[PDB]
């Protein structure tokens, strides 16, 4: 209710292209609060994806993009940046961020009370 999310940098990219991501937040925010980036495939559930939290901004990542994604976060402009580099087709799916009051990144979207409505990454060969 008193905070809203609004995600972008979705696109159409190639096998191998990056992509960052953008989730602003507005109204009632505080920035050790945990925000995530969570993605739902066509005819899968979501799932965690990346995650920032804590007073010195402690990231989590999934096994999914090990070695391939950079999360981070802009206090001053109240975003969070997903950077997802060597894209692959199983990468395809909405890419929504998610937070919750509190500072634990927690991996079930059933903790995370507020959603944006998502961006679309589709990588095609």
């Known amino acids: 209710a008193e905070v809203q999310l609004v995600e972008s940098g979705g696109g159409l990219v190639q096998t191998g292209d990056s992509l960052r991501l953008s989730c602003a937040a507005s109204?009632?925010?505080?920035?050790?609060?945990?925000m995530a980036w969570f993605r739902q495939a066509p005819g899968k559930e979501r799932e965690f994806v990346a995650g920032?939290?804590?007073?010195?901004?402690?990231?989590a990542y999934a096994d999914s993009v090990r070695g391939r994604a950079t999360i981070s976060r802009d206090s001053a402009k109240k975003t969070v940046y997903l950077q997802m580099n060597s894209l692959k087709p199983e990468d395809t799916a909405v890419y929504s961020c998610?937070?919750?009051?509190?500072?634990?990144?927690?991996?079930?979207?059933?903790?995370?009370?507020?959603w944006g409505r998502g961006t679309q990454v589709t990588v095609s060969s």
């Open positions: 998610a937070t919750r009051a509190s500072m634990q990144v927690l991996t079930s979207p059933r903790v995370y009370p507020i």
């Open positions: 920032i939290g804590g007073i010195d901004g402690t990231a």
């Open positions: 109204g009632r925010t505080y920035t050790p609060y945990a």
